[PDB]
Design a binder for these strands. Structure first.
Lengths: 260, 223, 134
RNA sequence: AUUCAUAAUAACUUUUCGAAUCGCAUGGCCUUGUGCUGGCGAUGGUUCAUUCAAAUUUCUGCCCUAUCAACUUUCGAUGGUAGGAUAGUGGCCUACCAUGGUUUCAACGGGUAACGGGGAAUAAGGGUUCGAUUCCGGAGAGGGAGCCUGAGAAACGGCUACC
RNA sequence: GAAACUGCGAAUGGCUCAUUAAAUCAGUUAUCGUUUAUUUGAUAGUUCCUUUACUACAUGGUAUAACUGUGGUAAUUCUAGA
């Protein structure tokens, strides 16, 4: 009706933000999306939901204006800038360099990295074709389109990029035997590494997915996202390690790992 | 009828009183700015070619030229008419004005001068008026003094002076269009960009032609 | 006066804001609901900031007396204590002062009549002075 | 899955497009002079993608009444063709041609103290009655109607007309 | 920096349920049947037909606001000539 609604309110939120309801208000609306949909992450929720440094909204407003917190080399000097997939976050002095990955339950992390490996992304390439002035163009996860790629990467791969120029460095294939880090669904991000895929043509396509826990489950193709070959992993792998070990034993191991 | 006398040569204005109830019958059935001989009015005025430039009335209605009706009319006025100064961005709007033929509906007539007369240069050119705001543009200087342009502007900058704070504020219009780098240093970098920029992706199709010549030779060596 | 034991829990330095974040534990038998401004003196003896360089709020006492919990925030300098701090608390601890504002009637009653004028308000003021009263 | 993306032809255009703008630092080099380089912001414009969107859009599901059995079509009903118009397919409107389309698996008409749903109250199982209203989505800003600006209004803390 | 032009906002919010029984709406598809303000990402050396009196690009033209001083009507965010 008549124009784009810029006010959303809490108790309509993408629940993986994990915002309570006694503050319970107009939610922090993201900006216009750089990368993908409203499964993103604004800045001023992250600084005082799990990172827990910000106290007032004017105080986190008094952070990003002075070119303090940096993303992808840039700063993104407006407030509610969204966050893509495996986004790097360059920090200031004391050097707490971060990275978003998602846990065994869809929630994020409290994750910190070093400056090593903190110079490249992995982008879900999805639309590679040739445009005007004869150039083959490629797209990324963030839409950071890059000129003159290596021809025949394929569709639906991931690439190792530059984030200072365009310049993808090392692509990867997508066949039977990889390692896959899926996102989207009830069971996003364990690892599945392959067991099978099929045609299913036109409606969707499916990827059969099995971690070291050796149960196998099936997920539609748009959610799967490789980050390597068998036993590769590219990134600093988090401490929940991507298993989603079951309901009883996590209570049983917290009955054990607290050391009674 | 009232005699608002104004003057397009450098400037003068004050509104005067009326008697000539029969010589205002010279005035009508032309809208604005055509002709009123001063001798057609009583001869307190001579050497004066009166052109008329509107006025007001009971109800305070101004005059717009889209008339040919000797009373008021309410009308759709949008952009370039006397009203709507602007407001809420269209806003067509509707108000009411009179235009043409002058009657005793009127209250004031804005009389404005074509020819200078001989007798009454005390309400036209008594004193030359101090027009306030000078030239703001550097283009508005060199033919303002006819400099036949080489005379290197910033010569005659008007400093206006009152030393009531002991330091007299020494101010002057701060002309734009001042031709020095950084007009040209900005201009040079845009001249320097597509030197350094357009060649850089021109030296990207070059490397595209190199390693893909061998790559399109490799599956051309398919046997 | 009965081993007030001002202790802390969850100390975290935030050096991009150059501050220490903490809570204010207190066990105060037979002296209940201690203070605000006296505690900013004693909290200095972990960083030696000043007498007034530490921001703090809270001190809800718990049922029965004897104990309270607050949330305090200490920075380096007073010159830093004008930059990233609660300005109402900067009014509070004697740092800032009263800042005057129109009560929200006579702010919105100030700017509505000034919205329905057009100039800067002396052209028509001459005309009312010229006519009515003429 | 394409006449797709793209490239080149042979041409057209009241030409659309490609800087006459501002802030800090004040550089480098000698051919010492507006010689020449000369960084970073703050804007803004052609295309192509991402988001925000917005538009349509197929499948199923909608209380009560046959003391409502036929309903529609020259005042478009149902199709085809051709054109217009849209931001965009299409009876969305027009010219011509054809006579169809729904229906006792309840069409059509009438009632609703009928905004729909997630949801409430009740509690062996199966239910019954609500849900105007803390969220989602639709509609309205006395009643209708038309409107210029703007990316986006049939806006109503915008406008014109009639009651 | 008081205004005032220029740019974006005013189409989101907030209220109410009047109309509205394959209509909205819930799920479910689709756009190879479409338009996008911004956020992000990349992207124009060729503009001269006088394509050699381009005539200035080491940088053009007017058309005007607040303001000055003159007004009306009783009033209205009423406006005029200079």
């Amino acid at each position: 009706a008549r124009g784009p609604k810029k006010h959303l309110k809490r108790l309509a939120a993408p629940h993986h933000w994990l915002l309570d309801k006694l503050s319970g208000c107009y939610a922090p609306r993201p900006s216009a999306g750089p990368h993908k949909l409203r499964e993103s992450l604004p800045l001023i929720v992250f600084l005082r939901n799990r990172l827990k440094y910000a106290l007032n909204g004017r105080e986190v407003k008094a952070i990003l204006m002075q070119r303090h917190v940096k993303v992808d080399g840039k700063v993104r000097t407006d407030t509610t800038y969204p966050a893509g997939f495996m986004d790097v976050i360059t920090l200031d002095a004391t050097n707490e360099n971060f990275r978003l990955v998602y846990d065994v339950k869809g929630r994020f992390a409290v994750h910190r990295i070093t400056d090593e490996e903190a110079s490249y992304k992995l982008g879900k390439v999805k639309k590679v074709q040739l445009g005007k002035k004869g150039v083959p163009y490629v797209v990324t996860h963030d839409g950071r389109t890059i000129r003159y790629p290596d021809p025949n990467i394929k569709v639906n791969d991931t690439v190792k990029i530059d984030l200072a120029s365009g310049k993808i460095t090392d692509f990867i294939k997508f066949d039977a035997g990889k390692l896959v880090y899926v996102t989207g669904g009830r069971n996003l991000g364990r690892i599945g590494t392959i067991v099978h895929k099929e045609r299913h043509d036109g409606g969707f396509d499916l990827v059969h997915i099995k971690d070291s826990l050796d149960n196998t489950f099936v997920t539609r193709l748009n959610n799967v996202f490789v980050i390597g070959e068998q036993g590769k992993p590219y990134i600093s792998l988090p401490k929940g390690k991507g298993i989603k070990l079951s309901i009883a034993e996590e209570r049983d191991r917290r009955r054990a790992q607290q050391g009674l | 009828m009232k005699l608002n006398i104004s003057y397009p040569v450098n400037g003068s204005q004050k509104t005067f009183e009326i008697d000539d109830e029969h010589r205002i019958r010279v005035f009508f059935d032309k809208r604005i700015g055509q002709e009123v001989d001063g001798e057609a009015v009583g001869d307190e005025f001579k050497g004066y070619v009166f052109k008329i430039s509107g006025g007001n009335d009971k109800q305070g209605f101004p005059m717009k030229q889209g008339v040919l009706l000797p009373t008021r009319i309410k009308l759709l006025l949008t952009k370039n008419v006397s009203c709507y100064r602007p407001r809420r961005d269209g806003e067509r709007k509707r108000k009411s004005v009179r235009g043409a033929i002058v009657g005793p509906d009127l209250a004031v007539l804005a009389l404005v001068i074509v020819k200078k007369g001989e007798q009454e240069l005390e309400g036209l050119t008594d004193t030359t008026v101090p027009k306030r705001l000078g030239p703001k543009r550097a283009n508005n200087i060199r033919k303002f003094f006819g400099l036949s342009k080489e005379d290197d502007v910033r010569d005659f900058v008007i400093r206006r002076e009152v030393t009531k704070g002991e330091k007299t504020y020494t101010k002057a219009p701060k002309i734009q269009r001042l031709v020095t780098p950084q007009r040209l240093q900005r201009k040079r970098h845009q001249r320097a960009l597509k030197v350094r920029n357009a060649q850089a992706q021109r030296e990207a199709a070059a490397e595209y032609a190199q390693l893909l010549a061998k790559r399109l030779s490799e599956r051309k060596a398919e046997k | 006066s009965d081993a007030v034991t001002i202790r802390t829990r969850k100390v975290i330095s935030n050096p991009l804001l150059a501050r220490k974040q903490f809570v204010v534990d207190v066990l105060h038998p037979n002296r209940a609901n201690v203070s605000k401004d006296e505690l900013r003196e004693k909290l200095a003896e972990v960083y030696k900031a000043e007498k007034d360089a530490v921001s703090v709020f809270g001190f809800r006492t718990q049922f029965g007396g004897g104990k309270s919990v607050g949330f305090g925030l200490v920075y380096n300098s007073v010159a830093e204590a004008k930059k990233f701090e609660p300005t109402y608390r900067l009014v509070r601890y004697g740092l800032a002062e009263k800042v005057e504002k129109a009560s929200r009637q006579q702010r919105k009653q100030k700017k509505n009549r000034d919205k329905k004028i057009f100039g800067t308000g002396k052209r028509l003021a001459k005309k009312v002075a010229r006519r009515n009263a003429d």
